[PDB]
Write an enzyme that holds these catalytic residues in place. Sequence first.
Site, PDB file in Angstrom:
ATOM      1  N   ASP A 124      11.354  -4.721 -16.917  1.00 26.64           N
ATOM      2  CA  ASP A 124       9.937  -4.431 -17.006  1.00 26.64           C
ATOM      3  C   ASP A 124       9.636  -2.949 -17.248  1.00 26.64           C
ATOM      4  O   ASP A 124       8.810  -2.339 -16.575  1.00 26.64           O
ATOM      5  CB  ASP A 124       9.240  -4.920 -15.745  1.00 26.64           C
ATOM      6  CG  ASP A 124       7.772  -5.190 -15.967  1.00 26.64           C
ATOM      7  OD1 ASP A 124       7.119  -5.531 -14.971  1.00 26.64           O
ATOM      8  OD2 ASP A 124       7.192  -5.070 -17.080  1.00 26.64           O
ATOM      9  N   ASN A 173       5.449   1.773 -15.027  1.00 26.84           N
ATOM     10  CA  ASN A 173       6.700   1.838 -14.265  1.00 26.84           C
ATOM     11  C   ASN A 173       7.444   3.133 -14.559  1.00 26.84           C
ATOM     12  O   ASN A 173       8.588   3.295 -14.142  1.00 26.84           O
ATOM     13  CB  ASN A 173       7.614   0.638 -14.590  1.00 26.84           C
ATOM     14  CG  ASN A 173       7.197  -0.644 -13.866  1.00 26.84           C
ATOM     15  OD1 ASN A 173       6.588  -0.595 -12.807  1.00 26.84           O
ATOM     16  ND2 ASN A 173       7.525  -1.798 -14.443  1.00 26.84           N
ATOM     17  N   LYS A 210       0.861  -1.175   0.000  1.00 28.81           N
ATOM     18  CA  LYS A 210       0.000   0.000   0.000  1.00 28.81           C
ATOM     19  C   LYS A 210       0.908   1.238   0.000  1.00 28.81           C
ATOM     20  O   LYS A 210       1.782   1.365   0.848  1.00 28.81           O
ATOM     21  CB  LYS A 210      -0.909   0.023   1.241  1.00 28.81           C
ATOM     22  CG  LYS A 210      -1.998  -1.065   1.293  1.00 28.81           C
ATOM     23  CD  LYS A 210      -3.292  -0.559   1.978  1.00 28.81           C
ATOM     24  CE  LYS A 210      -4.042  -1.664   2.727  1.00 28.81           C
ATOM     25  NZ  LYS A 210      -4.844  -1.119   3.862  1.00 28.81           N
TER      26      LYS A 210
HETATM   27  N1  LIG Z   1       6.758   7.705  -6.330  1.00 28.23           N
HETATM   28  C1  LIG Z   1       5.529   7.231  -6.488  1.00 28.23           C
HETATM   29  N2  LIG Z   1       4.492   8.083  -6.587  1.00 28.23           N
HETATM   30  C2  LIG Z   1       3.256   7.592  -6.749  1.00 28.23           C
HETATM   31  N3  LIG Z   1       2.901   6.301  -6.827  1.00 28.23           N
HETATM   32  C3  LIG Z   1       3.979   5.468  -6.721  1.00 28.23           C
HETATM   33  C4  LIG Z   1       5.293   5.851  -6.555  1.00 28.23           C
HETATM   34  N4  LIG Z   1       6.150   4.759  -6.485  1.00 28.23           N
HETATM   35  C5  LIG Z   1       5.340   3.738  -6.603  1.00 28.23           C
HETATM   36  N5  LIG Z   1       4.005   4.086  -6.752  1.00 28.23           N
HETATM   37  C6  LIG Z   1       2.914   3.131  -6.914  1.00 28.23           C
HETATM   38  O1  LIG Z   1       2.549   2.070  -6.060  1.00 28.23           O
HETATM   39  C7  LIG Z   1       2.289   1.004  -6.991  1.00 28.23           C
HETATM   40  C8  LIG Z   1       3.298  -0.128  -6.670  1.00 28.23           C
HETATM   41  O2  LIG Z   1       3.779  -0.748  -7.882  1.00 28.23           O
HETATM   42  P1  LIG Z   1       3.225  -2.120  -8.505  1.00 28.23           P
HETATM   43  O3  LIG Z   1       1.763  -1.958  -9.025  1.00 28.23           O
HETATM   44  O4  LIG Z   1       3.521  -3.178  -7.383  1.00 28.23           O
HETATM   45  O5  LIG Z   1       4.248  -2.562  -9.688  1.00 28.23           O
HETATM   46  P2  LIG Z   1       4.303  -1.748 -11.084  1.00 28.23           P
HETATM   47  O6  LIG Z   1       4.728  -2.701 -12.256  1.00 28.23           O
HETATM   48  O7  LIG Z   1       5.170  -0.492 -10.704  1.00 28.23           O
HETATM   49  N6  LIG Z   1       2.957  -0.717 -11.408  1.00 28.23           N
HETATM   50  P3  LIG Z   1       1.576  -1.313 -12.157  1.00 28.23           P
HETATM   51  O8  LIG Z   1       2.084  -0.789 -13.513  1.00 28.23           O
HETATM   52  O9  LIG Z   1       0.588  -0.331 -11.494  1.00 28.23           O
HETATM   53  O10 LIG Z   1       1.459  -2.848 -11.890  1.00 28.23           O
HETATM   54  C9  LIG Z   1       2.301   1.635  -8.416  1.00 28.23           C
HETATM   55  O11 LIG Z   1       1.375   1.116  -9.348  1.00 28.23           O
HETATM   56  C10 LIG Z   1       1.991   3.101  -8.120  1.00 28.23           C
HETATM   57  O12 LIG Z   1       0.617   3.288  -7.821  1.00 28.23           O
END
Ligand SMILES: Nc1ncnc2c1ncn2C1O[C@H](COP(=O)(O)OP(=O)(O)NP(=O)(O)O)[C@@H](O)[C@H]1O
Length: 292
Positions: A140, A145, A30
């Site tokens: 990825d 990302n 989260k």
């Molecule tokens: N600096 C940031 N500012 C805002 N949101 C962030 C930041 N860093 C990470 N997040 C996020 O928290 C989530 C964690 O990543 P996650 O979904 O586990 O992998 P992912 O491959 O980065 N993203 P997704 O493309 O959404 O599957 C992201 O989708 C964003 O919502």
Amino acid sequence: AKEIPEVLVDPRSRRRYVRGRFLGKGGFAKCFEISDADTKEVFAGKIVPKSLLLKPHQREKMSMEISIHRSLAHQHVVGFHGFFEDNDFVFVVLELCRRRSLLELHKRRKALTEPEARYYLRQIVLGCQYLHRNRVIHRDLKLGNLFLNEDLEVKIGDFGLATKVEYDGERKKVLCGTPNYIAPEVLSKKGHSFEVDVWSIGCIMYTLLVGKPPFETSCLKETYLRIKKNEYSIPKHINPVAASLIQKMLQTDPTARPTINELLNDEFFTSGYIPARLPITCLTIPPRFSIA
Ligand SMILES: Nc1ncnc2c1ncn2C1O[C@H](COP(=O)(O)OP(=O)(O)NP(=O)(O)O)[C@@H](O)[C@H]1O
Ligand SMILES: [Mg+2]
Ligand SMILES: [Mg+2]
Ligand SMILES: [Zn+2]
């Protein structure tokens, strides 16, 4: 249930952090806006519960991510500002990117203008050039990302599938995860290295210009059969020079692709208009790029 603590304290660095507004869940973590109680500066706070890291291998993957990500500082990489834990949670403190990612932008805009694509692609390439001289393959690179700060500057995040090339001509055989813009040499299980990231940037270039991803179907394994066969097409309205750079990147043979340090010297960049910055309106409205 096990609630997340309203304040988050770092025992080594003696820094306290107030849990502000909720930003969204991705997988285990989260994420939250978080404020130094003393410095008032705002960060992104990745918060994973340890009840979801019960398995040693999930812990090792999380360790490698932090080790790789924390070793990195660059303008177009999400800044790593530290991590810590208590008995119940892991905490990562990152550079906040208030305008979310290029996925959200693409959902709202689809095909961007050409100068907008040049602009975002230059920064992605720069960020990825730094990773590659630091012997990191991200593995990825995708729109989700690729994060945007308040100035619409790109910041590569999420080193969850990232790896380090420890020796010369090392071919990685293992990729625990499923990349979105997965290269043909990953799929055919032949061995892979840096060229994987260039493949993905070529998919990103296509998606940003065309407004849809290059190999998309209703079925993921059908998508993989298109990637194997190199089965895609570029709409005719895409300019010849842009089309040509995409083609160079979207080749099956990884040795045939250009290096990350070749990319910015392509005609697409050197002879096209690259804006110095984009106004916030570009989140929502196609820029005209007037001289007025
Ligand atoms: N600096 C940031 N500012 C805002 N949101 C962030 C930041 N860093 C990470 N997040 C996020 O928290 C989530 C964690 O990543 P996650 O979904 O586990 O992998 P992912 O491959 O980065 N993203 P997704 O493309 O959404 O599957 C992201 O989708 C964003 O919502
Ligand atoms: Mg997510
Ligand atoms: Mg991750
Ligand atoms: Zn695994």
